[PDB]
Structures are given as C-alpha cells and as structure tokens.
Amino acid sequence: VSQVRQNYHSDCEAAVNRMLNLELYASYTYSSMYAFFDRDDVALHNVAEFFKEHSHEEREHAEKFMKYQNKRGGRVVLQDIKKPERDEWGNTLEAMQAALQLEKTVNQALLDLHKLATDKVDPHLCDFLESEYLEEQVKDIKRIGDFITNLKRLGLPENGMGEYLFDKHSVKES
Amino acid sequence: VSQVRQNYHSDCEAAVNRMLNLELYASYTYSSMYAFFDRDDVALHNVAEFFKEHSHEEREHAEKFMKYQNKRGGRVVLQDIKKPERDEWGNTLEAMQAALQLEKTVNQALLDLHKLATDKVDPHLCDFLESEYLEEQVKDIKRIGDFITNLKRLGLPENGMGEYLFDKHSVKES
Amino acid sequence: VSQVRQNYHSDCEAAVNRMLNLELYASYTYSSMYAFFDRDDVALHNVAEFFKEHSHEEREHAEKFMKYQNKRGGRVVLQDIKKPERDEWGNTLEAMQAALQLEKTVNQALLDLHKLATDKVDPHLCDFLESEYLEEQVKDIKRIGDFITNLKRLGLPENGMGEYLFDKHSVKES
Amino acid sequence: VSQVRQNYHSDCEAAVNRMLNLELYASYTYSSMYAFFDRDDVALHNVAEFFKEHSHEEREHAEKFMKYQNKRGGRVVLQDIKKPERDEWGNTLEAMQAALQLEKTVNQALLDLHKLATDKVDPHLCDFLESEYLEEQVKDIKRIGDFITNLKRLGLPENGMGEYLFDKHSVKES
Ligand SMILES: [Cl-]
Ligand SMILES: [Cl-]
Ligand SMILES: [Cl-]
Ligand SMILES: [Cl-]
Ligand SMILES: [Cl-]
Ligand SMILES: [Cl-]
Ligand SMILES: [Cl-]
Ligand SMILES: [Cl-]
Ligand SMILES: [Cl-]
Ligand SMILES: [Cl-]
Ligand SMILES: [Cl-]
Ligand SMILES: [Cl-]
Ligand SMILES: [Cl-]
Ligand SMILES: [Cl-]
Ligand SMILES: [Cl-]
Ligand SMILES: [Cl-]
Ligand SMILES: [Cl-]
Ligand SMILES: [Cl-]
Ligand SMILES: [Cl-]
Ligand SMILES: [Cl-]
Ligand SMILES: [Cl-]
Ligand SMILES: [Cl-]
Ligand SMILES: [Cl-]
Ligand SMILES: [Cl-]
Ligand SMILES: [Cl-]
Ligand SMILES: [Cl-]
Ligand SMILES: [Cl-]
Ligand SMILES: [Cl-]
Ligand SMILES: [Cl-]
Ligand SMILES: [Cl-]
Ligand SMILES: [Cl-]
Ligand SMILES: [Cl-]
Ligand SMILES: [Cl-]
Ligand SMILES: [Cl-]
Ligand SMILES: [Cl-]
Ligand SMILES: [Cl-]
Ligand SMILES: [Cl-]
Ligand SMILES: [Cl-]
Ligand SMILES: [Cl-]
Ligand SMILES: [Cl-]
Ligand SMILES: [Cl-]
Ligand SMILES: [Fe+2]
Ligand SMILES: [Fe+2]
Ligand SMILES: [Fe+2]
Ligand SMILES: [Fe+2]
Ligand SMILES: [Fe+2]
Ligand SMILES: [Fe+2]
Ligand SMILES: [Fe+2]
Ligand SMILES: [Fe+2]
Ligand SMILES: [Fe+2]
Ligand SMILES: [Mg+2]
Ligand SMILES: [Mg+2]
Ligand SMILES: [Mg+2]
Ligand SMILES: [Mg+2]
Ligand SMILES: [Mg+2]
Ligand SMILES: [Mg+2]
Ligand SMILES: [Mg+2]
Ligand SMILES: [Mg+2]
Ligand SMILES: [Mg+2]
Ligand SMILES: [Mg+2]
Ligand SMILES: [Mg+2]
Ligand SMILES: [Mg+2]
Ligand SMILES: [Mg+2]
Ligand SMILES: [Mg+2]
Ligand SMILES: [Mg+2]
Ligand SMILES: [Mg+2]
Ligand SMILES: [Mg+2]
Ligand SMILES: [Mg+2]
Ligand SMILES: [Mg+2]
Ligand SMILES: [Mg+2]
Ligand SMILES: [Mg+2]
Ligand SMILES: [Mg+2]
Ligand SMILES: [Mg+2]
Ligand SMILES: [Mg+2]
Ligand SMILES: [Mg+2]
Ligand SMILES: [Mg+2]
Ligand SMILES: [Mg+2]
Ligand SMILES: [Mg+2]
Ligand SMILES: [Mg+2]
Ligand SMILES: [Mg+2]
Ligand SMILES: [Mg+2]
Ligand SMILES: [Mg+2]
Ligand SMILES: [Mg+2]
C-alpha cells in the first residue's frame, strides 16, 4: 500500500472515485443547461450564466475529491462521464426542477458516503464531507427550491413575461 | 421607594411594564413573519428581511422602556411573551394587513399610556412617548398602509407576478 | 413534504423548534439580568452590559435555528417565551451562578439534540451543532466559571468593594 | 408690553426669573463642593472636577433661562445668589447625597413651572422645559443615585480605600 495510507478502507477509496464521477456528471449536465439557455430561440442569458457557474463549481468539487484521494493514499480511477439525460431543457422551470433533482441525487450520494465512512470508522472522511460538501449542498438545494417557488408564482411554464422577469431579477446580472 | 423616584405614579410604572411586554410581543410576531417568508415554499426574501428588521426594532423599543423604568426608579417586571396569533401568514398582503393592525394596537397602547401620564401630571413620561414613540409609530403605520395599497394595485392575493414585483421593487433589496 | 426536504426526521424538526424556544428563554433571562444591574440601587453597569450583550447573542442563536429549520424544509413553530425564574438577581455572584446553570442547561439540550441527530443519522445537523453551537457553549461556560471563581476570591457576596472591583476590571468597560 | 410678547403670562415670566436664580444657586453649591474636594486635606481631584463641571452646567442652565425670557418678551430680574447651605461637605458620600437632594429640588421647581405653564396654556414654555430641562434632570438624578449606591457598596463613610477607589474609577479621570 501507499506509504501515507492510514485508516483508509478500500470501500471508501472506491466510493470516492464513484463520487468524483458523479460530480463530473453533474458538471456536464449544468454545461448542457448553459448551452440551452444561450440558444437564440431561448435567450435567457442570466439563467444560462447561472448554470455555467454551477458547471464550474461541480468540476471544482470533482477536483477536490481527486486531491482528497491522493492525500489519503488512494488511487484516482476515472470512468466515462455520461452525457446528460436530456438534449434540451424545456424552459427555466423544467431546468430548475431537473437541477433540484440532480442536487438531491448528489446529496444522497454524499450522505451514503458519510454512512460508509462512519461504518468504517473514518472520522477524517466524515469531517471532509461535513466541512466541504454537506452544508454547501443544503444551501444549493434551498436556493433552487426558492427559485422553483418563484417560477411557479410567476406563472411558468405558460407566462413568458414571468419567465423574462425571473431572468432579470432572480439570478445575478451577468 | 427608590432614591431617584420623583413624580412617578405606581400606575404609570405598571403601564410601562405592560407596554414593554407588548413591544416584545410585537417583536415576536415580526420574527414569525420573517421565518414564514424565508420558507422555501414562500421565498420572498426582501419581504422576510423587512419583517426581521422590524422584529429587531420592536425589541429595541422594549429595551428602551426597561431603561426608562430604571431611570425613573420603577422596577422592571417581566411576563411571558405570548406566541403570535398565527403560525403561517398566508401571503404578503395578509401579513402586511396583520402588521398594520399590530402597529395600530401598539399605537393605541402608547396613546393610552400618554393619557395616563397626562392624568398623573407626568410631563417627563409624556415627552418620552412623544419624542421616542408616537411619531415613529405614525411613520410605520403610513409606510405599511402605502404597501397595502400597492399590494392591492398589484392584484394580491391572486396575482403572483404582482407579489413577486412588490418584493423586488417596494421593499429594500437585502 | 417540502421540495427541499432530504434526510430530515420529524423528531429532529420538532427538537429544533424546542431548542429555538430555549434560546429565546435564555435571551429573556439575560435581559432580566441586564435590567436588574441597571437599577439605581444595584448600579453595576459593566455587569449589566455584559448580560445585555449575552441576551442579544442568545436571540441570534434562536434566529440561526429558524434559518436552519427552513434550510432543511422543516417548519418553524413558536411557543410562548416563559418569563425568567426570578424577578431580581441578588448580586453579581448569584447572577453569574444562575448564568452558569442556564448555559449548562442550554448545553445539555444541544448535546441531547446531537444524540437525536446521531440516532437519526443526520450528519448535517450534527455538523451544524458542532460547528455553530457546541464550542461557543464550552467557551461561555468556562468564562462564567472563571468569573465565579474570581467573585468568590473577591469576597462575594459580603465584600462590596470586591463586587465593585469585579465590575471595573473583569468585564469589558462599556 | 414688549412688541414680541404673545401668550406669555406675567406669572410665568416671574417663575422663569425664580428658576434662573435657583440654577445660579445650584451652580454656586457645586462650586463650593469643587473647592472642598480640592483642599489638601480632602484631595479627591476627580470628584472635585466632577463638581466643577456641574457648576458650569448649572450656570449654562441659568443663561438659557435669561435667553428664553428675552425671546418671549419678558424681563430678566435678578436677585442675590444665596451662599450654599454648608461650608464643608464631609466626604464624597455626604456631598453626593446633598447633590441628589439639590437635583431633586431643581427638578421639583421645573415640574412646578411646567404645571404653571400648563395652567396658563403656554405650550412653548412646556416644550422648552420638556426639550431642554426635564430629561437631562432625570439623567443627572439617576447618575448621582448610581454613585451613592456605589459609595455605600465601597463602605463610605468609614472605608477610605473605598472612597479612593471611587475617585479613580467611577468619575472621569481629569
Ligand atoms: Cl489503511
Ligand atoms: Cl484507526
Ligand atoms: Cl474505483
Ligand atoms: Cl454504461
Ligand atoms: Cl432530466
Ligand atoms: Cl431531450
Ligand atoms: Cl438526478
Ligand atoms: Cl459544506
Ligand atoms: Cl428566488
Ligand atoms: Cl400567470
Ligand atoms: Cl430594476
Ligand atoms: Cl414618586
Ligand atoms: Cl410634581
Ligand atoms: Cl407590573
Ligand atoms: Cl394568559
Ligand atoms: Cl393575525
Ligand atoms: Cl395559523
Ligand atoms: Cl393586533
Ligand atoms: Cl418618535
Ligand atoms: Cl409602498
Ligand atoms: Cl391583477
Ligand atoms: Cl426527509
Ligand atoms: Cl440518508
Ligand atoms: Cl414543534
Ligand atoms: Cl406551561
Ligand atoms: Cl434562577
Ligand atoms: Cl425573584
Ligand atoms: Cl437553568
Ligand atoms: Cl461553536
Ligand atoms: Cl474572570
Ligand atoms: Cl473578603
Ligand atoms: Cl402676552
Ligand atoms: Cl393663545
Ligand atoms: Cl420677577
Ligand atoms: Cl433673604
Ligand atoms: Cl446641605
Ligand atoms: Cl458647614
Ligand atoms: Cl436641596
Ligand atoms: Cl432635557
Ligand atoms: Cl456609578
Ligand atoms: Cl467596608
Ligand atoms: Fe457537487
Ligand atoms: Fe451541485
Ligand atoms: Fe414598537
Ligand atoms: Fe412597531
Ligand atoms: Fe423591473
Ligand atoms: Fe444560546
Ligand atoms: Fe448562552
Ligand atoms: Fe440646572
Ligand atoms: Fe443640576
Ligand atoms: Mg512505496
Ligand atoms: Mg481497493
Ligand atoms: Mg449512453
Ligand atoms: Mg461526527
Ligand atoms: Mg461548515
Ligand atoms: Mg454550492
Ligand atoms: Mg451542489
Ligand atoms: Mg454540491
Ligand atoms: Mg436566498
Ligand atoms: Mg434606598
Ligand atoms: Mg406599584
Ligand atoms: Mg397560549
Ligand atoms: Mg420627534
Ligand atoms: Mg419605526
Ligand atoms: Mg412601530
Ligand atoms: Mg413603533
Ligand atoms: Mg414612503
Ligand atoms: Mg410543494
Ligand atoms: Mg413532524
Ligand atoms: Mg408562568
Ligand atoms: Mg469550530
Ligand atoms: Mg458564545
Ligand atoms: Mg452560550
Ligand atoms: Mg451558546
Ligand atoms: Mg478568559
Ligand atoms: Mg415698544
Ligand atoms: Mg409681571
Ligand atoms: Mg444668609
Ligand atoms: Mg428630549
Ligand atoms: Mg445634565
Ligand atoms: Mg441637573
Ligand atoms: Mg439640570
Ligand atoms: Mg450610568
């Protein structure tokens, strides 16, 4: 084994690799949403830039797992990054609903990894997840939920003026 | 009696304690409104922060009565702070209507205390109410009335776009 | 359930509401201590301001639980804030002893909530308590214990000069 | 009558002259206390300077009544300023007790003048007293009461160390 390895279970090492892949998958889905809202026949540029920023965040999340793996003496093993589930995202409401589900999927994987780390008595991995992932996850889920509530209030999907107003007032001006 | 006490009637001392409690009650009601508008299924954050700020203002009002009591040689006597009348506040219009009524209730108590102070020939207490409470009360009542007029103009409760616009333009961006 | 809710047990939601109430109760007790030490026949103004500051801290603690509740998709439910156990607090030693007991009561409730969160496998709630509450609690308990030791050294309750000196040197000049 | 005179009763004019004299009397008493604490066999210089400052404040109070009289078209009429009741003031506790009584005597005269102004339906004079005199009076009475409580706590009159400590910590370093 690696000269640095201590209290790091093979199962946790493998699960970290799977989590890395999921972060990259999430990044790619957000990239797709960016490209969709940038289309000339969609043209909601603040929404597009919101998703582009989140795509970058998720890739940073992935890189943090790579660094973590090496710090513990595990070995990064990469797999294909699967393309997103859709090629087009409907409108801001449909995209935000998909984002909420994606964030909850990522959250569940993080919680499952915490359970595994707990089972294998790995407090360093528990701390890493709690300090770097779990709270930012709850914050993102809350933000997207708040957005969905406002999109519904604004009459999405039917109310185009509502969708226009959301892009101008609810997401940061880019 | 207290060595500082002069021209301070027992009835006024007691009424100041009751007014202190009412300020704390008002604070707590505004706290509840803050928490409601912060819910993910309500998500009107500028409205939420408006009510949070008012909750802090009312607690400051209460503390000013505590200080006043001691300055005159009266004794602060606290009672339970009753929970607010509602657990959920409907929407921005319903909440603002409740706020208007609350501010008028507080105003009536201040006016009643002024009547008592006048009856007991206590010009210091009259001045305190006039200089620190009565005008700020009229200003807050006017502000909330103006808000209600605009919420009705915007089609509340039915018009969700109107409610969204109020939160963006009528209350301070937080 | 709330669209944001994930891995949040009803028992934990309820316990967070109870903890919120306890924070408000603690705030109110400290408010009472402030008013007592501000009396003309007590007149220990640095001690008074110490308790006023702690009253504000506890209310901030309460507000942080409200925000937490909403972030997780729980619902804030408020109850009456009970008045403090005493109307007068004796002297600086008696008040500090009551403060120590209060801080230990709050600490026990936080520890009990951590046990519940652990039982329900909620690492986000565990992290929240550990990162935002448990250490600041230990620090406050240590500070108050240190104060009590010094008040006893200074000859409280009998030694009025000792009590005067504590207010001038041990608590921050306000 | 004076070309400016309007709604100013002769009784109020006379009472303003009497109040002016009382302010000058209070100033002179505080001057005497200053000189006493400046004695080489008393030598409490921060206490001395406290009383000197208050002597100046009272003379400013007197001058404000002179200005007021002329603003309303009344005529300033001066009488002898009687010497203080004592030639020596015992110690810090005795002096502060005399100061408390003096401030309450001045306060009673201000309250009596407010009653007269009310009886003669003079809202300008009522406002003047409320805005310029009554609250600063309550503040000074509270401050002196707080001092007396602390002097007693410090073991005055017998405890010379207590008296020394009061001069160093309770009154401003001059
Ligand atoms: Cl290992
Ligand atoms: Cl181990
Ligand atoms: Cl692997
Ligand atoms: Cl496959
Ligand atoms: Cl999808
Ligand atoms: Cl598709
Ligand atoms: Cl998903
Ligand atoms: Cl985090
Ligand atoms: Cl939003
Ligand atoms: Cl609509
Ligand atoms: Cl705008
Ligand atoms: Cl009285
Ligand atoms: Cl009177
Ligand atoms: Cl009462
Ligand atoms: Cl009741
Ligand atoms: Cl109501
Ligand atoms: Cl309700
Ligand atoms: Cl009401
Ligand atoms: Cl006002
Ligand atoms: Cl408005
Ligand atoms: Cl409408
Ligand atoms: Cl859940
Ligand atoms: Cl789970
Ligand atoms: Cl509950
Ligand atoms: Cl009960
Ligand atoms: Cl107690
Ligand atoms: Cl009691
Ligand atoms: Cl307790
Ligand atoms: Cl902490
Ligand atoms: Cl200490
Ligand atoms: Cl001792
Ligand atoms: Cl006239
Ligand atoms: Cl007239
Ligand atoms: Cl005259
Ligand atoms: Cl004579
Ligand atoms: Cl005398
Ligand atoms: Cl004499
Ligand atoms: Cl006198
Ligand atoms: Cl004043
Ligand atoms: Cl003092
Ligand atoms: Cl003594
Ligand atoms: Fe992520
Ligand atoms: Fe994410
Ligand atoms: Fe108020
Ligand atoms: Fe108010
Ligand atoms: Fe706009
Ligand atoms: Fe607390
Ligand atoms: Fe505390
Ligand atoms: Fe004066
Ligand atoms: Fe004076
Ligand atoms: Mg090797
Ligand atoms: Mg392996
Ligand atoms: Mg495929
Ligand atoms: Mg842990
Ligand atoms: Mg953290
Ligand atoms: Mg994030
Ligand atoms: Mg995320
Ligand atoms: Mg995340
Ligand atoms: Mg937000
Ligand atoms: Mg007494
Ligand atoms: Mg009474
Ligand atoms: Mg009830
Ligand atoms: Mg005013
Ligand atoms: Mg106001
Ligand atoms: Mg108000
Ligand atoms: Mg008010
Ligand atoms: Mg306005
Ligand atoms: Mg729903
Ligand atoms: Mg439940
Ligand atoms: Mg009870
Ligand atoms: Mg920490
Ligand atoms: Mg603390
Ligand atoms: Mg604490
Ligand atoms: Mg604490
Ligand atoms: Mg320390
Ligand atoms: Mg003429
Ligand atoms: Mg005349
Ligand atoms: Mg004579
Ligand atoms: Mg004033
Ligand atoms: Mg003054
Ligand atoms: Mg004065
Ligand atoms: Mg005065
Ligand atoms: Mg003071």
The 3 state secondary structure assigned to chain A is CCCCCCCCCHHHHHHHHHHHHHHHHHHHHHHHHHHHHCCCCCCCHHHHHHHHHHHHHHHHHHHHHHHHHHHHCCCCCCCCCCCCCCCCCCCHHHHHHHHHHHHHHHHHHHHHHHHHHHHCCCHHHHHHHHHHHHHHHHHHHHHHHHHHHHHHHCCCCCCHHHHHHHHHHCCCCC
Contact between chains at A138 and C71 (C-beta distance less than 8 A):
yes
Q: Do chains A and D touch (3 or more CB pairs under 8 A)?
A: no
* Lookup: tokens for C42: 């007590």
CA angle C137, C140, C141 (to 5 degrees): 85
> What's the count of helices (H) and strands (E) in chain C, helices before strands?
6, 0
Structure tokens at D40: 């080489």
Rounded to the nearest whole angstrom, what is the distance from the C-alpha of residue A62 to the centroid of ligand 56? 13
D7 contacts: CB under 8 Å, gap ≥ 6: D121, D122, D124
Looking at residue A45, its amino acid is: H
State the structure-solving technique: X-ray
CA distance B108 to B113: 9
- Helix C45-72 / helix B10-37 crossing angle, nearest 10 deg: 30
Across-strand partners of C81? B81
Q: Which helix (H) or strand (E) holds B62?
A: helix B45-72
List of residues 6+ apart from B91 with CB closer than 8 A = B156, B157, B163
Question: Residue B104 and residue C61: Cα distance in Å, rounded?
Answer: 30
| D63-122 residues touching B, CB cutoff 8 A | 100, 104, 107-108, 111, 114-115, 118
Task: Return the SS3 of D91.
Answer: coil
CA distances from A136 to A22, A96, A149, B167 (A): 16, 17, 20, 26
Asked, as a colleague might, if the bond just before C157 is cis with ω within 30 of 0, I would say yes
Closest CA to D125 of D134, D113, D138: D113
Go through B118-148 and write b for each residue having 16 or more CB atoms within 10 A of its CB, e for each that does not: eebebbbbbbbbeeebbeebeebbeebeebb
* Min Cα separation A166/chain B (Å): 9
* Cβ-based contacts of C45 with chain D (< 8 Å): 146
Angle between helices B45-72 and B10-37 (to 10 degrees): 160
Tokens 């448990």 correspond to what residue?
A: C134
What phi and psi values does residue B8 have, to the nearest 5 degrees? -120, 105
Other CB atoms within a 10 A radius of the CB of residue B87 amount to 13
Which of D149, D156, D166 would you mutate first to test chain C, the one with the most C CBs within 10 A? D149
Dihedral pair phi/psi, residue D82, rounded to 5°: -65, 140
Domain ranges of chain A: 1-174
Task: Quote the tokens at residue D34.
Answer: 């200053």
The answer to whether C98 and C89 have CB atoms below 8 angstroms apart is: yes
Distance C12 CA to ligand 69 centre (A): 8
Rounded Cα distance, B54 and B136, in Å:
12
Q: Which residue of C has its CA nearest to B29?
A: C78
For residue D68 the two structure tokens come to 């007021």
Q: By three-state DSSP, how is residue B75 classified?
A: coil
Query: Which residues, 6 or more positions from A88, have their beta carbon under 8 angstroms from its beta carbon?
Result: A36
Cβ atoms of A115 and A134 within 8 Å: the answer is no
Residue B49: CB atoms within 10 A of its CB come to 18
Whole-angstrom distance, CA of residue A37 vs CA of residue A88: 9
Let me know: does A31 contact A52? Beta carbons within 8 Å: yes
Q: What is the resolution of this structure in A?
A: 1.2
Of D139, D137, D110, the closest CA to residue D126 belongs to D110
Say whether the C–A interface has 3 or more Cβ pairs within 8 Å: yes
CA angle D86, D91, D96 (to 5 degrees): 75
For B159, nearest residue in chain A (alpha carbons): A153
Nearest to D106 by CA among D36, D171, D29: D29
Instruction: For A24, list phi and psi in degrees, rounded to 5.
Output: -65, -40
Between the alpha carbon of residue B102 and those of residues B23, B95, B98, the distances in Å are 10, 10, 6
| CA D69 to centroid of chain Cα atoms | 19
Question: Which DSSP state fits B131?
Answer: I
> Which chains would you list as touching C if contact means 3+ CB atom pairs under 8 Å?
A, B, D
| CB atoms A135 and C126 under 8 Å | no
- With contacts defined as CB-CB under 8 Å, which chain C residues touch A142? 4, 70-71
- In whole angstroms, what separates CA B142 from the centre of its chain? 13
Q: What Å distances lie between residue D79 and D32, D63, D66, D82, D108, CA to CA?
A: 20, 14, 13, 9, 20
Compute how many other C-beta atoms are within 10 angstroms of the C-beta atom of residue B1. Answer: 9
Q: What is the dihedral of CA A52, A53, A59, A62, to 10 degrees?
A: -140
Which residues, 6 or more positions from D25, have their beta carbon under 8 angstroms from its beta carbon? D81, D82
Bridge partners of B81, per DSSP, are C81
Cβ-based burial of C121 (10 A; exposed 0-12, middle 13-18, buried ≥19): middle
Enter the tokens of residue D58: 């009272």
H or E stretch covering D124: helix D123-129
Amino acid at the residue D118: T
What is the C-alpha separation between D12 and B128, in angstroms, rounded?
24
Angle at alpha carbon of residue C66, lines to C65 and C72, rounded to 5°: 85
Q: Is B2 within 8 Å of chain C by CB?
A: yes
Out of C43, C161, C168, the one facing D146 most closely (by C-beta) is C43
Contacting chains of B (3 CB pairs or more, <8 Å) are A, C, D
Nearest to residue B6, comparing CAs of D94, D106, D118, D107? D107
Tokens 């206590």 belong to residue: B122
Q: How close, in Å, is residue D44 to chain B by CA atoms?
A: 25
User: Which ligand is closest to the CA of A74, given by its number?
Assistant: 52
Sign of CA dihedral D10, D12, D16, D17: positive
Distance from CA of B4 to the nearest CA of C (A): 7
Whole-Å CA distances, D11 to C51, C141, D115: 49, 63, 12
Binding residues of A for Fe cation: 23, 58, 61, 103, 137, 140
A91-95 contacts, C-beta under 8 A, 24 or more apart: A91/A156, A91/A157, A91/A163, A92/A37, A92/A44, A92/A47, A92/A151, A92/A156, A92/A163, A92/A166, A92/A167, A93/A148, A93/A151, A93/A152, A93/A156, A93/A157, A93/A163, A94/A157, A95/A33, A95/A36, A95/A37, A95/A47, A95/A51
| Backbone conformation region of residue C43, classed left if phi is above 0, alpha if psi is from -120 to 50, else beta | left
Give domain A1-174's CATH architecture: Up-down Bundle (1.20)
Q: Which residue of D has its CA nearest to C40?
A: D146
Helix (H) or strand (E) holding C63: helix C45-72
Residue C52 CA from chain centroid, whole number = 12
Answer positive or negative: Cα dihedral of D4, D10, D16, D20: positive
CA of A79 to the centre of ligand 4 (A): 10
Q: If we measure between CA atoms, which residue out of C40, C24, C35 comes closest to residue C88?
A: C35
Considering only residues 141 to 170 of chain D, which have any Cβ-Cβ distance to chain C shorter than 8 Å? 142, 145-147, 149-150, 152-155, 159, 161-162, 165, 169
